[PDB]
Amino acid sequence: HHATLTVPTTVPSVSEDCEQLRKAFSGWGTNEGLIIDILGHRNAEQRNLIRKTYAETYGEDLLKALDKELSNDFERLVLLWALDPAERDALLANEATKRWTSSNQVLMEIACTRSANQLLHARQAYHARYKKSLEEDVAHHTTGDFHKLLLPLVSSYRYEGEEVNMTLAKTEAKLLHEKISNKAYSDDDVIRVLATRSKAQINATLNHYKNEYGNDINKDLKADPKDEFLALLRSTVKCLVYPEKYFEKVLRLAINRRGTDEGALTRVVCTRAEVDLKVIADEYQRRNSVPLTRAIVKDTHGDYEKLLLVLAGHVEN
Ligand SMILES: [Ca+2]
Ligand SMILES: [Ca+2]
Ligand SMILES: [Ca+2]
C-alpha cells in the first residue's frame, strides 16, 4: 500500500480513545499531543466510530469540541483530517465555490484525483451537509471555459476498469491534437475525452498522442503561459494520469517559497495520507532531493508540524 497513515497493530477500544480525548479537552487549554497521538493514528472507520461514540457517551460533537479547543493551522489540519474522506472532500469542494475561498484548481483536483465512488461518496456527503448538489454550486459559481470543463468533471462517474481500446485511443489522440492545434481548447471533444473516458483510456490516448506527435499533450497547452484555462487543462491531464506529479508540484510550490501555503500543504497531506502520500513523497524526494518530512520540518512549527509529520508517516523519532 501507498498510504502514509500508521495505525497501531493493537487499536484501543472506542471508549478508551474517547475518554482519552475527553481528558485532552479538560481545563484551560488542550493537550494537542494527546489529540495528535490518537486521531493521527486512526483510519476513517475508527474515526467515524470515535465520533459516533463520543456523541453518545458525552453528549457532544467531537468536531465541535475540536473546533472550540484549537486554533489556526493546527485546528484546520485536525478538523480536515478527522473527517471521513467523503465529508472532507465535500467541505473542501464547498469552500472552493465560495467567495473568499474559491478555487477552480481544488474543484478540478477533487474531481480528477478521486476514484468514481470516492467522488460519488463526496457528492452524497455534500447532499447531507449542504442540502444541494456539488454540480449546482459548481455550475452556479463558474463561467466560460471553466464552467464548460468543471461541470462535467465534478459530475463524472467514470468507468474504472483497466480495459483499454487502442483504436479509439489512436482516433481520439488525433482529435485532441487537431482541436488543440486550432486553439479550440474547450471544444466538446477536448472536454469529452477528459471528463468522460476512463483514466486508463485517457492515459492510452495521451500515450498515442505522444507516439504520434513526439511530445506530450501539455507541451501543446502552453501557447499562452498566462492563460488560466490552459493551466487548468494541463493540471487536469496530470491529475487524471499522473496524480503524484500533480501533488508533488502542489507541495513544491507550497513549501519551496518564502512562505508556506499552509492551505495547499494541509489539503495535500490530509487528503492523500490515506491514499498515496508515500508515492507523492517519493516523487517529492526525486524532484527536490529532500525528503518531504524534512522539507516540512523546516517550513513548519509546533503542533501543525507535528501532525503534518505524523500524517506523513513519521514514527516516534
Ligand atoms: Ca479545554
Ligand atoms: Ca518556505
Ligand atoms: Ca520546525
PDB file of C-alpha atoms and ligand atoms in Angstrom:
ATOM      1  CA  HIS A   1       0.000   0.000   0.000  1.00  0.00           C
ATOM      2  CA  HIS A   2       0.931   3.601  -0.759  1.00  0.00           C
ATOM      3  CA  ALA A   3      -0.721   5.125   2.299  1.00  0.00           C
ATOM      4  CA  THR A   4       1.347   7.053   4.929  1.00  0.00           C
ATOM      5  CA  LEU A   5      -1.024   6.835   7.845  1.00  0.00           C
ATOM      6  CA  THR A   6       0.158   4.480  10.594  1.00  0.00           C
ATOM      7  CA  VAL A   7      -2.273   2.627  12.863  1.00  0.00           C
ATOM      8  CA  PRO A   8      -1.251   0.562  15.924  1.00  0.00           C
ATOM      9  CA  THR A   9      -1.360  -3.238  15.483  1.00  0.00           C
ATOM     10  CA  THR A  10      -3.468  -3.168  18.658  1.00  0.00           C
ATOM     11  CA  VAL A  11      -6.180  -0.491  18.500  1.00  0.00           C
ATOM     12  CA  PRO A  12      -7.599   0.575  21.899  1.00  0.00           C
ATOM     13  CA  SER A  13     -11.364   0.313  22.452  1.00  0.00           C
ATOM     14  CA  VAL A  14     -13.515   3.155  21.128  1.00  0.00           C
ATOM     15  CA  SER A  15     -14.400   4.199  24.713  1.00  0.00           C
ATOM     16  CA  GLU A  16     -10.736   4.067  25.717  1.00  0.00           C
ATOM     17  CA  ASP A  17      -9.943   6.513  22.877  1.00  0.00           C
ATOM     18  CA  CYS A  18     -12.995   8.586  23.719  1.00  0.00           C
ATOM     19  CA  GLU A  19     -12.149   9.058  27.391  1.00  0.00           C
ATOM     20  CA  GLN A  20      -8.576   9.945  26.469  1.00  0.00           C
ATOM     21  CA  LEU A  21      -9.804  12.688  24.097  1.00  0.00           C
ATOM     22  CA  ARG A  22     -12.201  13.956  26.796  1.00  0.00           C
ATOM     23  CA  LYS A  23      -9.237  14.249  29.161  1.00  0.00           C
ATOM     24  CA  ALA A  24      -7.321  16.085  26.430  1.00  0.00           C
ATOM     25  CA  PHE A  25     -10.005  18.799  26.404  1.00  0.00           C
ATOM     26  CA  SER A  26     -10.115  19.327  30.152  1.00  0.00           C
ATOM     27  CA  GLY A  27      -9.029  22.636  31.653  1.00  0.00           C
ATOM     28  CA  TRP A  28      -7.959  25.931  30.167  1.00  0.00           C
ATOM     29  CA  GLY A  29      -6.275  24.713  27.004  1.00  0.00           C
ATOM     30  CA  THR A  30      -5.875  21.336  25.340  1.00  0.00           C
ATOM     31  CA  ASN A  31      -3.341  18.523  25.207  1.00  0.00           C
ATOM     32  CA  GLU A  32      -2.691  18.776  21.444  1.00  0.00           C
ATOM     33  CA  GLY A  33      -0.069  15.990  21.545  1.00  0.00           C
ATOM     34  CA  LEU A  34      -2.598  13.551  23.003  1.00  0.00           C
ATOM     35  CA  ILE A  35      -5.053  14.503  20.279  1.00  0.00           C
ATOM     36  CA  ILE A  36      -2.367  14.006  17.646  1.00  0.00           C
ATOM     37  CA  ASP A  37      -1.439  10.671  19.207  1.00  0.00           C
ATOM     38  CA  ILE A  38      -4.952   9.319  18.907  1.00  0.00           C
ATOM     39  CA  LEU A  39      -6.589  10.888  15.828  1.00  0.00           C
ATOM     40  CA  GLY A  40      -3.358  10.969  13.821  1.00  0.00           C
ATOM     41  CA  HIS A  41      -3.282   7.192  14.089  1.00  0.00           C
ATOM     42  CA  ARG A  42      -6.837   6.106  13.294  1.00  0.00           C
ATOM     43  CA  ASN A  43      -8.367   5.186   9.943  1.00  0.00           C
ATOM     44  CA  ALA A  44     -11.724   6.534   8.747  1.00  0.00           C
ATOM     45  CA  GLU A  45     -13.882   3.751  10.234  1.00  0.00           C
ATOM     46  CA  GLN A  46     -12.085   4.196  13.563  1.00  0.00           C
ATOM     47  CA  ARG A  47     -12.518   7.963  13.466  1.00  0.00           C
ATOM     48  CA  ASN A  48     -16.189   7.594  12.426  1.00  0.00           C
ATOM     49  CA  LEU A  49     -16.795   5.192  15.332  1.00  0.00           C
ATOM     50  CA  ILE A  50     -14.945   7.545  17.706  1.00  0.00           C
ATOM     51  CA  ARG A  51     -17.162  10.440  16.648  1.00  0.00           C
ATOM     52  CA  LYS A  52     -20.302   8.315  16.936  1.00  0.00           C
ATOM     53  CA  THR A  53     -19.296   7.039  20.384  1.00  0.00           C
ATOM     54  CA  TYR A  54     -18.085  10.430  21.632  1.00  0.00           C
ATOM     55  CA  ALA A  55     -21.515  11.861  20.810  1.00  0.00           C
ATOM     56  CA  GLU A  56     -23.429   9.027  22.534  1.00  0.00           C
ATOM     57  CA  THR A  57     -21.239   8.871  25.650  1.00  0.00           C
ATOM     58  CA  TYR A  58     -20.575  12.587  26.358  1.00  0.00           C
ATOM     59  CA  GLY A  59     -23.495  14.225  24.536  1.00  0.00           C
ATOM     60  CA  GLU A  60     -21.366  16.469  22.324  1.00  0.00           C
ATOM     61  CA  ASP A  61     -19.879  16.604  18.865  1.00  0.00           C
ATOM     62  CA  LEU A  62     -16.150  15.819  18.926  1.00  0.00           C
ATOM     63  CA  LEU A  63     -15.586  18.131  15.923  1.00  0.00           C
ATOM     64  CA  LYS A  64     -17.374  20.929  17.822  1.00  0.00           C
ATOM     65  CA  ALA A  65     -15.039  20.349  20.772  1.00  0.00           C
ATOM     66  CA  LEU A  66     -12.037  20.207  18.441  1.00  0.00           C
ATOM     67  CA  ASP A  67     -13.084  23.484  16.842  1.00  0.00           C
ATOM     68  CA  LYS A  68     -13.597  25.329  20.173  1.00  0.00           C
ATOM     69  CA  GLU A  69     -10.490  23.799  21.704  1.00  0.00           C
ATOM     70  CA  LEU A  70      -7.957  24.682  18.975  1.00  0.00           C
ATOM     71  CA  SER A  71      -6.880  27.364  16.561  1.00  0.00           C
ATOM     72  CA  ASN A  72      -5.257  28.257  13.285  1.00  0.00           C
ATOM     73  CA  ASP A  73      -3.420  25.878  11.044  1.00  0.00           C
ATOM     74  CA  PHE A  74      -3.373  23.107  13.590  1.00  0.00           C
ATOM     75  CA  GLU A  75      -7.171  23.404  14.017  1.00  0.00           C
ATOM     76  CA  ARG A  76      -7.797  23.368  10.270  1.00  0.00           C
ATOM     77  CA  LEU A  77      -5.481  20.330   9.828  1.00  0.00           C
ATOM     78  CA  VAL A  78      -7.087  18.345  12.659  1.00  0.00           C
ATOM     79  CA  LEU A  79     -10.646  19.015  11.547  1.00  0.00           C
ATOM     80  CA  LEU A  80      -9.911  18.370   7.901  1.00  0.00           C
ATOM     81  CA  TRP A  81      -8.051  15.213   8.909  1.00  0.00           C
ATOM     82  CA  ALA A  82     -10.661  13.985  11.386  1.00  0.00           C
ATOM     83  CA  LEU A  83     -13.472  13.957   8.852  1.00  0.00           C
ATOM     84  CA  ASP A  84     -14.436  10.981   6.767  1.00  0.00           C
ATOM     85  CA  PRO A  85     -12.642  11.449   3.404  1.00  0.00           C
ATOM     86  CA  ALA A  86     -16.070  11.935   1.711  1.00  0.00           C
ATOM     87  CA  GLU A  87     -17.050  14.666   4.268  1.00  0.00           C
ATOM     88  CA  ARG A  88     -13.588  16.216   3.935  1.00  0.00           C
ATOM     89  CA  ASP A  89     -13.936  16.385   0.106  1.00  0.00           C
ATOM     90  CA  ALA A  90     -17.465  17.788   0.376  1.00  0.00           C
ATOM     91  CA  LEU A  91     -16.196  20.505   2.720  1.00  0.00           C
ATOM     92  CA  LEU A  92     -13.228  21.286   0.505  1.00  0.00           C
ATOM     93  CA  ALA A  93     -15.335  21.277  -2.614  1.00  0.00           C
ATOM     94  CA  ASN A  94     -17.860  23.551  -0.920  1.00  0.00           C
ATOM     95  CA  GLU A  95     -15.160  26.051   0.130  1.00  0.00           C
ATOM     96  CA  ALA A  96     -13.926  26.024  -3.464  1.00  0.00           C
ATOM     97  CA  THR A  97     -17.154  27.527  -4.838  1.00  0.00           C
ATOM     98  CA  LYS A  98     -17.372  30.302  -2.325  1.00  0.00           C
ATOM     99  CA  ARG A  99     -16.388  33.842  -2.209  1.00  0.00           C
ATOM    100  CA  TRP A 100     -13.351  34.228  -0.109  1.00  0.00           C
ATOM    101  CA  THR A 101     -12.160  30.846  -0.645  1.00  0.00           C
ATOM    102  CA  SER A 102     -12.759  29.854  -4.205  1.00  0.00           C
ATOM    103  CA  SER A 103     -10.719  27.632  -6.363  1.00  0.00           C
ATOM    104  CA  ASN A 104     -11.070  26.095  -9.681  1.00  0.00           C
ATOM    105  CA  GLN A 105      -7.931  24.022  -9.150  1.00  0.00           C
ATOM    106  CA  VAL A 106      -9.414  22.447  -5.982  1.00  0.00           C
ATOM    107  CA  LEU A 107     -12.666  21.501  -7.765  1.00  0.00           C
ATOM    108  CA  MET A 108     -10.630  20.052 -10.631  1.00  0.00           C
ATOM    109  CA  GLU A 109      -8.421  18.270  -8.140  1.00  0.00           C
ATOM    110  CA  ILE A 110     -11.230  16.614  -6.208  1.00  0.00           C
ATOM    111  CA  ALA A 111     -12.954  15.529  -9.407  1.00  0.00           C
ATOM    112  CA  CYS A 112      -9.833  14.139 -11.120  1.00  0.00           C
ATOM    113  CA  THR A 113      -7.824  12.519  -8.314  1.00  0.00           C
ATOM    114  CA  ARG A 114     -10.703  10.620  -6.731  1.00  0.00           C
ATOM    115  CA  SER A 115     -11.996   7.235  -7.842  1.00  0.00           C
ATOM    116  CA  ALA A 116     -15.550   7.250  -9.195  1.00  0.00           C
ATOM    117  CA  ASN A 117     -17.011   6.021  -5.923  1.00  0.00           C
ATOM    118  CA  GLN A 118     -14.916   8.394  -3.792  1.00  0.00           C
ATOM    119  CA  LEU A 119     -16.280  11.254  -5.863  1.00  0.00           C
ATOM    120  CA  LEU A 120     -19.793   9.844  -5.518  1.00  0.00           C
ATOM    121  CA  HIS A 121     -19.358   9.491  -1.735  1.00  0.00           C
ATOM    122  CA  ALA A 122     -18.287  13.151  -1.583  1.00  0.00           C
ATOM    123  CA  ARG A 123     -21.393  14.150  -3.564  1.00  0.00           C
ATOM    124  CA  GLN A 124     -23.570  12.209  -1.081  1.00  0.00           C
ATOM    125  CA  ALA A 125     -21.865  13.872   1.910  1.00  0.00           C
ATOM    126  CA  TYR A 126     -22.391  17.122   0.007  1.00  0.00           C
ATOM    127  CA  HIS A 127     -26.154  16.442  -0.159  1.00  0.00           C
ATOM    128  CA  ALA A 128     -26.349  15.554   3.532  1.00  0.00           C
ATOM    129  CA  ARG A 129     -24.429  18.601   4.769  1.00  0.00           C
ATOM    130  CA  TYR A 130     -25.404  21.354   2.313  1.00  0.00           C
ATOM    131  CA  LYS A 131     -28.806  20.188   1.073  1.00  0.00           C
ATOM    132  CA  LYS A 132     -27.697  20.797  -2.502  1.00  0.00           C
ATOM    133  CA  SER A 133     -25.582  19.277  -5.255  1.00  0.00           C
ATOM    134  CA  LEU A 134     -21.929  19.947  -5.859  1.00  0.00           C
ATOM    135  CA  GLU A 135     -22.807  20.292  -9.588  1.00  0.00           C
ATOM    136  CA  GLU A 136     -25.352  23.026  -8.926  1.00  0.00           C
ATOM    137  CA  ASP A 137     -22.899  25.056  -6.841  1.00  0.00           C
ATOM    138  CA  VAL A 138     -20.127  24.451  -9.355  1.00  0.00           C
ATOM    139  CA  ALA A 139     -22.437  25.294 -12.230  1.00  0.00           C
ATOM    140  CA  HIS A 140     -23.705  28.401 -10.437  1.00  0.00           C
ATOM    141  CA  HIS A 141     -20.273  29.737  -9.468  1.00  0.00           C
ATOM    142  CA  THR A 142     -18.117  29.125 -12.565  1.00  0.00           C
ATOM    143  CA  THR A 143     -18.400  30.667 -16.045  1.00  0.00           C
ATOM    144  CA  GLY A 144     -16.873  30.391 -19.552  1.00  0.00           C
ATOM    145  CA  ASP A 145     -14.436  27.571 -20.257  1.00  0.00           C
ATOM    146  CA  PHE A 146     -14.066  26.894 -16.580  1.00  0.00           C
ATOM    147  CA  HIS A 147     -17.800  26.143 -16.388  1.00  0.00           C
ATOM    148  CA  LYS A 148     -17.649  24.008 -19.529  1.00  0.00           C
ATOM    149  CA  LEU A 149     -14.914  21.807 -18.092  1.00  0.00           C
ATOM    150  CA  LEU A 150     -15.672  21.721 -14.378  1.00  0.00           C
ATOM    151  CA  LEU A 151     -19.358  20.873 -14.577  1.00  0.00           C
ATOM    152  CA  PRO A 152     -18.732  17.549 -16.345  1.00  0.00           C
ATOM    153  CA  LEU A 153     -15.595  16.892 -14.284  1.00  0.00           C
ATOM    154  CA  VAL A 154     -17.411  17.036 -10.890  1.00  0.00           C
ATOM    155  CA  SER A 155     -20.379  15.218 -12.435  1.00  0.00           C
ATOM    156  CA  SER A 156     -18.447  12.192 -13.725  1.00  0.00           C
ATOM    157  CA  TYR A 157     -18.969   8.687 -12.543  1.00  0.00           C
ATOM    158  CA  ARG A 158     -16.090   7.153 -14.574  1.00  0.00           C
ATOM    159  CA  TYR A 159     -15.752   3.551 -15.599  1.00  0.00           C
ATOM    160  CA  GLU A 160     -12.834   2.211 -13.512  1.00  0.00           C
ATOM    161  CA  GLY A 161     -11.800  -0.942 -15.323  1.00  0.00           C
ATOM    162  CA  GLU A 162      -8.379  -1.467 -16.862  1.00  0.00           C
ATOM    163  CA  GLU A 163      -9.776  -2.218 -20.354  1.00  0.00           C
ATOM    164  CA  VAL A 164      -8.269  -0.019 -22.994  1.00  0.00           C
ATOM    165  CA  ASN A 165      -9.440   0.459 -26.562  1.00  0.00           C
ATOM    166  CA  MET A 166      -6.402   1.150 -28.727  1.00  0.00           C
ATOM    167  CA  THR A 167      -8.192   2.026 -31.920  1.00  0.00           C
ATOM    168  CA  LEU A 168     -10.281   4.616 -30.033  1.00  0.00           C
ATOM    169  CA  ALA A 169      -7.178   5.870 -28.200  1.00  0.00           C
ATOM    170  CA  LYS A 170      -5.486   6.415 -31.547  1.00  0.00           C
ATOM    171  CA  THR A 171      -8.542   8.187 -33.067  1.00  0.00           C
ATOM    172  CA  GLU A 172      -9.099  10.419 -30.057  1.00  0.00           C
ATOM    173  CA  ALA A 173      -5.389  11.284 -29.839  1.00  0.00           C
ATOM    174  CA  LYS A 174      -5.561  12.956 -33.291  1.00  0.00           C
ATOM    175  CA  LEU A 175      -8.894  14.640 -32.495  1.00  0.00           C
ATOM    176  CA  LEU A 176      -7.268  16.134 -29.399  1.00  0.00           C
ATOM    177  CA  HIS A 177      -4.275  17.250 -31.457  1.00  0.00           C
ATOM    178  CA  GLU A 178      -6.426  18.726 -34.218  1.00  0.00           C
ATOM    179  CA  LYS A 179      -8.594  20.737 -31.827  1.00  0.00           C
ATOM    180  CA  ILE A 180      -5.673  21.946 -29.664  1.00  0.00           C
ATOM    181  CA  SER A 181      -3.768  22.937 -32.786  1.00  0.00           C
ATOM    182  CA  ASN A 182      -6.677  25.187 -33.805  1.00  0.00           C
ATOM    183  CA  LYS A 183      -6.781  26.831 -30.336  1.00  0.00           C
ATOM    184  CA  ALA A 184     -10.175  25.225 -29.634  1.00  0.00           C
ATOM    185  CA  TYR A 185      -9.111  24.259 -26.110  1.00  0.00           C
ATOM    186  CA  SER A 186     -12.653  23.997 -24.786  1.00  0.00           C
ATOM    187  CA  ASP A 187     -14.208  22.191 -27.766  1.00  0.00           C
ATOM    188  CA  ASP A 188     -16.764  19.496 -26.888  1.00  0.00           C
ATOM    189  CA  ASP A 189     -14.237  16.827 -27.853  1.00  0.00           C
ATOM    190  CA  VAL A 190     -11.468  18.012 -25.521  1.00  0.00           C
ATOM    191  CA  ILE A 191     -13.923  18.319 -22.654  1.00  0.00           C
ATOM    192  CA  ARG A 192     -15.454  14.976 -23.589  1.00  0.00           C
ATOM    193  CA  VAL A 193     -12.309  12.906 -23.555  1.00  0.00           C
ATOM    194  CA  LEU A 194     -11.051  14.378 -20.251  1.00  0.00           C
ATOM    195  CA  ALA A 195     -14.432  14.364 -18.440  1.00  0.00           C
ATOM    196  CA  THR A 196     -15.988  11.085 -19.629  1.00  0.00           C
ATOM    197  CA  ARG A 197     -13.403   8.456 -20.702  1.00  0.00           C
ATOM    198  CA  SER A 198     -11.900   6.139 -18.060  1.00  0.00           C
ATOM    199  CA  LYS A 199      -8.477   7.117 -16.644  1.00  0.00           C
ATOM    200  CA  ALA A 200      -6.908   4.064 -18.329  1.00  0.00           C
ATOM    201  CA  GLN A 201      -8.389   5.086 -21.693  1.00  0.00           C
ATOM    202  CA  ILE A 202      -7.204   8.714 -21.339  1.00  0.00           C
ATOM    203  CA  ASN A 203      -3.746   7.517 -20.411  1.00  0.00           C
ATOM    204  CA  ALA A 204      -3.742   5.360 -23.596  1.00  0.00           C
ATOM    205  CA  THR A 205      -4.906   8.325 -25.597  1.00  0.00           C
ATOM    206  CA  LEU A 206      -2.053  10.508 -24.302  1.00  0.00           C
ATOM    207  CA  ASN A 207       0.467   7.760 -24.980  1.00  0.00           C
ATOM    208  CA  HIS A 208      -0.655   7.550 -28.619  1.00  0.00           C
ATOM    209  CA  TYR A 209      -0.649  11.318 -28.708  1.00  0.00           C
ATOM    210  CA  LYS A 210       2.986  11.302 -27.725  1.00  0.00           C
ATOM    211  CA  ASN A 211       3.976   8.443 -30.060  1.00  0.00           C
ATOM    212  CA  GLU A 212       2.315  10.221 -32.914  1.00  0.00           C
ATOM    213  CA  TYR A 213       3.440  13.847 -32.328  1.00  0.00           C
ATOM    214  CA  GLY A 214       6.668  13.322 -30.379  1.00  0.00           C
ATOM    215  CA  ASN A 215       5.745  15.471 -27.366  1.00  0.00           C
ATOM    216  CA  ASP A 216       3.185  15.046 -24.594  1.00  0.00           C
ATOM    217  CA  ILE A 217      -0.123  16.906 -24.660  1.00  0.00           C
ATOM    218  CA  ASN A 218       0.846  19.527 -22.003  1.00  0.00           C
ATOM    219  CA  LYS A 219       3.639  20.852 -24.232  1.00  0.00           C
ATOM    220  CA  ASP A 220       0.954  21.900 -26.714  1.00  0.00           C
ATOM    221  CA  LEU A 221      -1.167  23.510 -23.977  1.00  0.00           C
ATOM    222  CA  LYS A 222       1.357  26.286 -23.312  1.00  0.00           C
ATOM    223  CA  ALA A 223       0.772  28.764 -26.196  1.00  0.00           C
ATOM    224  CA  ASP A 224      -0.215  31.398 -23.613  1.00  0.00           C
ATOM    225  CA  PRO A 225       1.736  30.878 -20.324  1.00  0.00           C
ATOM    226  CA  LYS A 226      -0.567  33.453 -18.683  1.00  0.00           C
ATOM    227  CA  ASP A 227      -3.870  31.749 -19.600  1.00  0.00           C
ATOM    228  CA  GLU A 228      -5.633  30.267 -16.550  1.00  0.00           C
ATOM    229  CA  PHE A 229      -7.721  27.838 -18.650  1.00  0.00           C
ATOM    230  CA  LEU A 230      -4.630  26.222 -20.201  1.00  0.00           C
ATOM    231  CA  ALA A 231      -3.143  25.780 -16.742  1.00  0.00           C
ATOM    232  CA  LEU A 232      -6.362  24.049 -15.689  1.00  0.00           C
ATOM    233  CA  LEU A 233      -6.210  21.735 -18.716  1.00  0.00           C
ATOM    234  CA  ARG A 234      -2.575  20.883 -18.007  1.00  0.00           C
ATOM    235  CA  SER A 235      -3.484  20.201 -14.405  1.00  0.00           C
ATOM    236  CA  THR A 236      -6.483  18.072 -15.361  1.00  0.00           C
ATOM    237  CA  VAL A 237      -4.272  15.971 -17.572  1.00  0.00           C
ATOM    238  CA  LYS A 238      -1.753  15.439 -14.751  1.00  0.00           C
ATOM    239  CA  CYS A 239      -4.403  14.638 -12.160  1.00  0.00           C
ATOM    240  CA  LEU A 240      -6.073  12.037 -14.363  1.00  0.00           C
ATOM    241  CA  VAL A 241      -2.978  10.098 -15.425  1.00  0.00           C
ATOM    242  CA  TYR A 242      -0.006  11.295 -13.325  1.00  0.00           C
ATOM    243  CA  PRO A 243      -1.689  12.311  -9.984  1.00  0.00           C
ATOM    244  CA  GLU A 244       1.567  12.052  -7.992  1.00  0.00           C
ATOM    245  CA  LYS A 245       3.385  14.509 -10.277  1.00  0.00           C
ATOM    246  CA  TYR A 246       0.458  16.892  -9.748  1.00  0.00           C
ATOM    247  CA  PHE A 247       0.576  16.610  -5.978  1.00  0.00           C
ATOM    248  CA  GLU A 248       4.373  16.789  -5.851  1.00  0.00           C
ATOM    249  CA  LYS A 249       4.174  20.123  -7.596  1.00  0.00           C
ATOM    250  CA  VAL A 250       1.431  21.403  -5.312  1.00  0.00           C
ATOM    251  CA  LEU A 251       3.642  20.598  -2.322  1.00  0.00           C
ATOM    252  CA  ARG A 252       6.679  22.037  -4.023  1.00  0.00           C
ATOM    253  CA  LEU A 253       5.143  25.476  -4.614  1.00  0.00           C
ATOM    254  CA  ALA A 254       3.539  25.398  -1.211  1.00  0.00           C
ATOM    255  CA  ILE A 255       6.852  24.729   0.555  1.00  0.00           C
ATOM    256  CA  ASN A 256       9.692  25.989  -1.718  1.00  0.00           C
ATOM    257  CA  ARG A 257       8.985  29.610  -1.358  1.00  0.00           C
ATOM    258  CA  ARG A 258       9.440  32.301   1.263  1.00  0.00           C
ATOM    259  CA  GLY A 259       6.150  31.182   2.784  1.00  0.00           C
ATOM    260  CA  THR A 260       4.268  28.123   3.285  1.00  0.00           C
ATOM    261  CA  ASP A 261       0.941  27.895   1.576  1.00  0.00           C
ATOM    262  CA  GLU A 262      -0.434  26.054   4.550  1.00  0.00           C
ATOM    263  CA  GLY A 263      -3.789  25.525   2.795  1.00  0.00           C
ATOM    264  CA  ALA A 264      -2.238  23.601  -0.085  1.00  0.00           C
ATOM    265  CA  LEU A 265       0.061  21.682   2.298  1.00  0.00           C
ATOM    266  CA  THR A 266      -2.774  20.823   4.634  1.00  0.00           C
ATOM    267  CA  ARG A 267      -5.002  19.785   1.711  1.00  0.00           C
ATOM    268  CA  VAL A 268      -2.428  17.519   0.116  1.00  0.00           C
ATOM    269  CA  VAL A 269      -1.304  15.850   3.319  1.00  0.00           C
ATOM    270  CA  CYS A 270      -4.739  15.372   4.813  1.00  0.00           C
ATOM    271  CA  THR A 271      -6.492  14.199   1.642  1.00  0.00           C
ATOM    272  CA  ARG A 272      -3.714  11.848   0.456  1.00  0.00           C
ATOM    273  CA  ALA A 273      -2.341  10.423   3.698  1.00  0.00           C
ATOM    274  CA  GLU A 274      -4.846   7.528   3.479  1.00  0.00           C
ATOM    275  CA  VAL A 275      -4.390   7.036  -0.296  1.00  0.00           C
ATOM    276  CA  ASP A 276      -0.995   7.556  -1.996  1.00  0.00           C
ATOM    277  CA  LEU A 277       1.085  10.035   0.014  1.00  0.00           C
ATOM    278  CA  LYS A 278       4.026   7.654   0.124  1.00  0.00           C
ATOM    279  CA  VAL A 279       4.092   7.761  -3.707  1.00  0.00           C
ATOM    280  CA  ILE A 280       3.823  11.559  -3.681  1.00  0.00           C
ATOM    281  CA  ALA A 281       6.648  11.734  -1.114  1.00  0.00           C
ATOM    282  CA  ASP A 282       8.966   9.571  -3.289  1.00  0.00           C
ATOM    283  CA  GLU A 283       8.081  11.939  -6.114  1.00  0.00           C
ATOM    284  CA  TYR A 284       8.894  14.824  -3.782  1.00  0.00           C
ATOM    285  CA  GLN A 285      12.348  13.371  -2.990  1.00  0.00           C
ATOM    286  CA  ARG A 286      13.072  12.657  -6.657  1.00  0.00           C
ATOM    287  CA  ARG A 287      12.100  16.129  -7.687  1.00  0.00           C
ATOM    288  CA  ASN A 288      13.594  18.150  -4.789  1.00  0.00           C
ATOM    289  CA  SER A 289      16.416  15.978  -3.357  1.00  0.00           C
ATOM    290  CA  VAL A 290      14.991  16.433   0.178  1.00  0.00           C
ATOM    291  CA  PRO A 291      12.589  14.066   1.899  1.00  0.00           C
ATOM    292  CA  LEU A 292       9.041  15.533   2.255  1.00  0.00           C
ATOM    293  CA  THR A 293       9.127  15.099   6.003  1.00  0.00           C
ATOM    294  CA  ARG A 294      12.392  17.033   6.162  1.00  0.00           C
ATOM    295  CA  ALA A 295      11.001  19.765   3.957  1.00  0.00           C
ATOM    296  CA  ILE A 296       8.096  20.094   6.329  1.00  0.00           C
ATOM    297  CA  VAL A 297      10.336  20.157   9.433  1.00  0.00           C
ATOM    298  CA  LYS A 298      11.922  23.025   8.032  1.00  0.00           C
ATOM    299  CA  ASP A 299       8.974  25.146   6.896  1.00  0.00           C
ATOM    300  CA  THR A 300       6.503  24.448   9.743  1.00  0.00           C
ATOM    301  CA  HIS A 301       6.285  24.704  13.551  1.00  0.00           C
ATOM    302  CA  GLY A 302       4.703  23.250  16.648  1.00  0.00           C
ATOM    303  CA  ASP A 303       1.626  21.082  16.642  1.00  0.00           C
ATOM    304  CA  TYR A 304       0.892  21.857  12.974  1.00  0.00           C
ATOM    305  CA  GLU A 305       4.323  20.450  12.003  1.00  0.00           C
ATOM    306  CA  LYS A 306       3.972  17.608  14.399  1.00  0.00           C
ATOM    307  CA  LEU A 307       0.653  16.432  12.902  1.00  0.00           C
ATOM    308  CA  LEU A 308       1.811  17.037   9.339  1.00  0.00           C
ATOM    309  CA  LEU A 309       4.720  14.775  10.210  1.00  0.00           C
ATOM    310  CA  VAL A 310       2.572  12.151  11.935  1.00  0.00           C
ATOM    311  CA  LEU A 311       0.162  12.085   8.971  1.00  0.00           C
ATOM    312  CA  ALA A 312       3.139  11.852   6.592  1.00  0.00           C
ATOM    313  CA  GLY A 313       4.277   8.607   8.243  1.00  0.00           C
ATOM    314  CA  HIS A 314       6.712   9.739  10.997  1.00  0.00           C
ATOM    315  CA  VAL A 315       7.089   7.193  13.771  1.00  0.00           C
ATOM    316  CA  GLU A 316       8.325   8.168  17.208  1.00  0.00           C
ATOM    317  CA  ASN A 317      11.624   9.789  16.426  1.00  0.00           C
TER     318      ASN A 317
HETATM  319 CA    CA B   1     -10.131  22.921  27.354  1.00  0.00          CA
HETATM  320 CA    CA B   2       9.007  28.215   2.508  1.00  0.00          CA
HETATM  321 CA    CA B   3      10.375  23.201  12.529  1.00  0.00          CA
END
